[PDB]
Amino acid sequence: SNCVADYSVLYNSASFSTFKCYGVSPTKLNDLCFTNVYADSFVIRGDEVR
Amino acid sequence: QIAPGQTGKIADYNYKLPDDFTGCVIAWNSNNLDSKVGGNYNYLYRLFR
Amino acid sequence: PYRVVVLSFELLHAPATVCGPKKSTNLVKNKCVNFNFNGLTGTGVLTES
Amino acid sequence: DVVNQNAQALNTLVKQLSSNFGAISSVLNDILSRLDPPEAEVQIDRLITG
Numbered sequence: 001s002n003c004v005a006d007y008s009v010l011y012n013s014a015s016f017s018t019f020k021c022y023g024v025s026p027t028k029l030n031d032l033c034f035t036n037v038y039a040d041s042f043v044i045r046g047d048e049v050r
Numbered sequence: 051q052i053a054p055g056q057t058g059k060i061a062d063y064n065y066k067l068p069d070d071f072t073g074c075v076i077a078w079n080s081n082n083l084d085s086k087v088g089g090n091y092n093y094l095y096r097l098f099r
Numbered sequence: 100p101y102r103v104v105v106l107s108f109e110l111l112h113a114p115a116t117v118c119g120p121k122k123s124t125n126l127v128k129n130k131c132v133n134f135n136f137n138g139l140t141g142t143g144v145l146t147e148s
Numbered sequence: 149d150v151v152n153q154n155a156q157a158l159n160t161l162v163k164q165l166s167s168n169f170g171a172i173s174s175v176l177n178d179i180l181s182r183l184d185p186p187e188a189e190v191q192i193d194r195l196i197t198g
Contacts, residue, residue: 001116001117002116002117003117004117004118004119004120005117005118005119005120006119006120008120011058011059011097012097017101019057019058023110023182024110024182024183025055025182025183025184025187025188026055026056026057026184027055027056027057027184028181028182028183028184029057029119030119030120030121031119031121031135031138031140031181032110032118032119032138032181032182033115033117033118033119033137033138034108034109034110034115034117034118035108035109035110035112035113035114035115035116035117036107036108036109036113037106037107037108037117038106038107038108039104039105039106040104040105040106040107041102041103041104041105042102042103043100043101043102043103044100044101044103045100045101046100046101049101049103054186055184055186055187069184069185069186070186110182111178111181111182138181138182139177139178139181140177140180140181141177
């Protein structure tokens, strides 16, 4: 909460293999404003990413 | 990222596809020809724009 | 191993505090302008309520 | 009765703008923001048909 989500920073040191967005188009993420943002993180095997 | 309606450094600053595209995108791994033991620095990409 | 982060949110129904890198402009009233209030786009005339 | 029926018909025509018609939202602004053209066209077409 209370921060600008400028994801251009991740371009230098991140390489994501699977990026899927549901309910929103990935090209519209630069114009929107999100409420009640939560980040869930965990580690699984390669076959259960799907 | 080579697909209509995608984000990322490639689709934003390097190569963008139109939303109405007729055609096929074909890709295959080339690690046996485009990789060197010390590294291959001949391939470039645009990171800032 | 693969690290997975899932990001959840709602859109255009409740007050938001994150927003994007878009830069805001001045408020022009009593005129027909395109507006972008917290991601909600549209056209109309803005008046005091 | 004539004026009542005509007024009711116009009022219900106005009120039927709140129907999703199978789309994710009933407002074109909310469809056009957070959806890019290629997948917002489907929702817009549903609303147009309704």
